[PDB]
């Protein structure tokens, strides 16, 4: 049954990837504001 | 039933790819502003 | 029914490809501005 | 049975990754506020 | 049986990582408040 | 049998890491209160 | 047999680290009370 | 055999570290009471 | 054989460190009583 | 052979350190009684 | 040979330090009795 | 050869320090008896 | 050769210090008897 | 050559200090007998 | 040459100090006999 | 040349001090005999 | 030249002091004989 | 209830610190007047 | 109940510190008047 | 309610710090006048 | 029960300190009047 | 409501820091005048 | 039981200190009246 | 509303930093004058 | 509206950074003068 | 049992100190009346 | 309108960077003079 | 047993001190009456 | 119009980069002189 | 018109790159001198 | 056994001191009556 | 006309590339000297 | 006319390529010397 | 006439190709020496 | 005979190819598990 | 005969390839476990 | 004969490759244990 | 003949590579023990 | 002939690399012992 | 000829590297002994 | 000719590095002896 | 010509570094002797 | 010409550093002798 | 011209540093002689 | 012109420092003579 | 013009410091003569 | 105008300090003559 | 206007200090003449 | 107006101090004449 | 108004002090005339 | 109103002190005339 | 009302003191006339 538990770990890693991508969006806004 | 759970993980990874692409759009605006 | 869920994942990957292509358009504008 | 215990450790590491990503979101807000 | 004891040590290190990530969230709030 | 004794030392070091992380949480609250 | 005696010394150093971490928790409460 | 005697010295130094850490706990209580 | 005699001196210095740490505990109680 | 004689002097200095530490314990009791 | 004679002087100074430390113990008892 | 004569003077000064320390012990007993 | 004569004066001053210390011992006995 | 004559004066002053110290010993015996 | 004559005066004053110290010894015996 | 004459006066005053000190010795014997 | 004449007066006063001191010696013998 | 009584003692010590600081102000005026 | 009695002693010592500080204020006025 | 009383003590200590700082200003004027 | 009796002695010594401080206030007035 | 009272204490400590900084300015003028 | 008797002696010495302090107050009034 | 009060404390700390920086400028002038 | 007040604090911190940089310029002149 | 008898002597000396202090009070009144 | 105020803060930080760079130029001259 | 007899002498001397102190009280009344 | 103000900040940062590069040139001269 | 201002910033960054390249030339001379 | 006989002489001298003190009390009454 | 200004920036970047290439030549000489 | 200016930039980039190729020749000599 | 200028750029690129080919010859010698 | 030795090298390379192919089988299982 | 020595080097390189392939097998197991 | 010496270097490099491959095997076991 | 000396350097570098590979083996054991 | 001297430097650097690799082996043993 | 002198400096730096590596070996033994 | 003088300085700095490395060897022996 | 004089200063600083390194060697011997 | 005078000051400071280093050597001998 | 006068002051301060360093050498000899 | 007068004061203070350093040399000789 | 008058006072204080330093030299000679 | 009058008082106090320093020189000569 | 009158008193006290210092000079001559 | 009258008293006391200092000068001449 | 009358008494006491100081001057002349 | 009458008595006592001081002046003239 | 009558007695005693002082003046004239 350990397989299901690693599958939940896979979903939680995907949520971490979503939130890191939103962080990259806001860092790109910071680069736009620094470039001017 | 673990298969369905990995399929949800696949969808969440695709959402992460969408948000990374929007981050690349805004970084490209930053490169346009730095190039001038 | 997992098949339908992977098909939604296919559509979301295609949206990611669209947004990456717009990022490449704006990076090409940055290369035009750097080339002058 | 040690395998299950490492699987719980994998889930807890994934939770740590989620919270680090939220920290990166708020640090990116700090960079937006410093860039202006 | 020492293996199980190191596995408990792995879980406790993961709990330490969770709490360090919450500390990074609150330090990022401190950086937002200093940036204004 | 010394191996087991070092494994207990590993667990006690992990408990020390947990309590240091809680100390970092409260120091981050102190930084939030100083930043205002 | 000296090895076992140093292993007991390792455990006692880990107990010292635990109590120093609790001291850091209470010093962080002192910093919260000074920051207001 | 001098090695064993230095190992006993190592244990006694670790006991000194434990008691110094308890002294730091009570000094932190003193700082909490002075901060109010 | 002088080496053994310095090792006894090392043990006696460690006993001095233990008793100084207990003195620091009681001085910290004195600071708690003065802080109120 | 003078080396052995200085080693005895080292032991006697360590005994002096032990008794000074006990004096510091009792002075700390005096500070507790004065603080109330 | 004067070196040996100074080494005896070093031992006698260490005995003086021992007896001064016992004097400090009894003066600390005097401070405990005055503090009440 | 005057060096040896000053070394004897050093030993006699150390004996004076021993007897002054015993005088301080008995003066501390006098302070204990006056403090009650 | 006057140097040797001052060295004898140094020894006689050290003897005076020894006898003054014995006088201080007996004066401390007098203080013990007066304190009761 | 007057230097030697003052050095003899220094020795005679040291003898005076020795005899004054013996006088202080006997005065301390007188104080012990008066204190009872 | 007057310097030598004052140096003889210094020696005679030191002899006076020796004899005054012996007088103080015998006066201290008189105080011992009066104290009983 | 008057300086030499005052120096002789200084020597004669020192002789007077010697004889006064012997008078004090014999008066102290008189006090010993009266004290019994 | 009157200065020299006062210096002779100083010497004669010192001779008077010598003879008064011998008178005090013999009066002290008289006190010893009266004390018995 | 003794805690409240020590808290009143803390307030009275703070008043003493205020008045000592005013004394230091006027001593600094005295140093200005002495420096000219 | 002796604790309460020492707490009253602590308050009375604090009153003594207040009045000593007022004495230092007036001594500083005296130093200002002497400095002119 | 003792907490409020220590908070008043904190305010009075801050007033003491203000007045000590004004004393340091005037001592610095005294150092300027002494330096010339 | 002797402890209570020394505590009363502590209170009476504190009253003595209060009255000595008032004496120092009036001596400071005397110094102000002498300085003019 | 104690929080507001500590906030007033924070403001008064900041005023103390301002006045200490002005004291450091004038001490730096004193160092300029001493350096010449 | 002699301890209790010395404790009564301690109280009577404290009463003597109180009355000496009142004497110092009135001597300070005498100094104020002499200073005018 | 306590937030506004800490914000005023932040402004006053910034004024303290300005004045400390001017003090560092004048200390650097003092170092230039000492270096020659 | 507290945001505006922290923005004024940000400007005052930037002024502090300007003046610290001028202090570093003059300390570098001091290092040039010491290096020769 | 002689110890108890000296303790009674200590109490009687303390009574003598009380009455001498009252004598000093009345002598201070005499100084006030002479100062006018 | 707070945005404009942070933009002024950005300009003042850039001025601080200019002056720090001039300080680094003069420190590099100091290193050239020390290297010879 | 002579020790007990000297202890009775000590008590009788203390009674003499009490009565001399009462004599000083009445002489101080005489000084008050003469001062008017 | 804030955009223009950030553009001026961009120019001032570029001036800072120019002056840092000149500092690196002179530090490289210092390294040439140290390498020989 | 902001575009022209960023173009001037681009030219100033290119000047910074030129001067950094000259710094790299001189650091390479330093490496040649260290390699021998 | 002569020691006991001198101890009786010491007691009789103490009785003489008591009666002389009563004589001083009555002479002080005589001074009070003469002062009016 | 901004186009011409970016063309000047292109020329200045090419000059930077020339000077970086000369730096690489001299670093290659440094590698030849280190390889032997 | 901007075309001519980019053509000069093309020539300067070709000169950079020539000098990079000479750097690669000397790095290849360094590889020959390291290979032996 | 820009055509001629690009033709000179073509010749300079061909010279760069010649020198890169000589670099490849010497790197091939390095590979021969490493292969043995 | 070197030919046989290269033939053994050929066999060992073929074994390496077998094990790399099994690695590709398991990587293909990993791709199947990631594709769902 | 160097040819044989390079042939042994060829065999040892083939053994390295075998062990790298087993490492790739176990890394593929790690990828299977991460993919779930 | 240098050729033979480089051939021995080739064999030693092949042994290094074997041991690095065993290190990669054990790192792959570490990745398997982390993946669960 | 320098060629032979560099060939010995090549062999010693290969020995260094062997020992670094054994260090990597033992670090991989450390990673296996940390992963559990 | 300097070439030979740098070749000896190359050999000594290779010996340094050997001994650093043995240090890394023993640090890896330390990591194995800490990991348990 | 300075080149030869720097080559001797290169050899002495290589000897320093050898001895630092032996120091790292013994520090690694210290870490092994602390890890147990 | 100054170049030669700096080259001698380079050699003397290398000798300093050798002796510092021997100091680090003996400090590592001290750490081995403290670790047991 | 000042350059030569600073070069002599560089040599004298290098001699100071040599002697400080020998001091560190002997302090490390002191640490070895204290560690036993 | 002041530059030359500061260069002489630099040489004299270097001589001071040499003599301080010899003082540190002899203090390290003192620490070796105290450590035994 | 005041600059030259401060430069002479710099030289005289350097002479003071030389003589203080010789004083530290002789104090270190005193510590060597006391340590035996 | 006052600046020149303070510069003369600086020179006279430096002469005072020279003579104080010679006093410290001779006090260190006194400590050497007392240590034997 | 008072500034000039204080500058003359500064010079006279420096002369006082010179003469006090010569007094310390001669007191150090006195300590050398007493130490023998 | 009182300021000028205090400045004259400052000069007269400095003259007093000069003459006290000459008195200390001659008292040090007296100590040299007494020490022999 | 009383301030001016106290300033005249300050000058007259400074004249008294000058004449007391001359008295100390002549008393030091008296001590030189007595020391011989 | 009484203040002015006490200021005249202060001046007259300062005149008394001047004349007492002249008396001390002439008494010091008397001591010089007695010392010879 | 009695205050003014005591102020006149203060002035008359100061006149008495002046005339007593003149009496001490003439008594010092008498001592000079007796000392010769 | 008796206070005023004692104040007149104080003035008359001060007149008595003035006339006694004139008597001491004339007695000092008598001592000058007797000393010759 | 008797108090007023004693105050008149105090005034009449002060008149007696005035007339006794005039008698002492005329007796001092008698001593001047007898001394000649």
Author numbering:
A (entry chain j), B (entry chain p), C (entry chain v), D (entry chain d), E (entry chain X), F (entry chain R), ...: 1 to 36
Lines from the paper:
A structural interaction is identified based on an appropriately placed pair of arginine residues (RxxxR) within the corresponding peptide sequences. In contrast to most structurally characterized filaments based on synthetic α-helical coiled-coils, the chain axes of the helical protomers are oriented in a plane nearly perpendicular to the long axis of the assembly.
Therefore, the designed series of Form I-like peptides encompassed minimal peptide sequences in which the structurally determinative distance between the RxxxR motif and the C-terminus was systematically varied over the range from 2 to 5 heptad repeats. Similarly, the 4-start helices of 29-17-3 and 29-24-3 and the 3-start helices of 36-31-3, passing through every fourth subunit and every third subunit, respectively, were associated with the axial stacking direction of the protofilaments within the corresponding assemblies. Similarly, the filament structure of 36-31-3 revealed that the C-terminus of peptide (i) interacted with the axially offset RxxxR motif of peptide (i + 5) within the 1-start (C1) symmetry of the assembly. Finally, while the local helix crossing angle associated with the arginine clasp interaction was maintained at 94°, the distal segments of the 36-31-3 helices bend at a more acute crossing angle of 80° in order to maintain the overall helical symmetry of the filament. The results of this analysis are reported for the 36-31-3 filament, although similar results were obtained for the other Form I-like assemblies. The results suggested that the arginine clasp motif, which involves a helix terminus interacting with the side of another helix at a nearly 100° angle, was not common within the structures of naturally occurring proteins and, consequently, not natively designable.
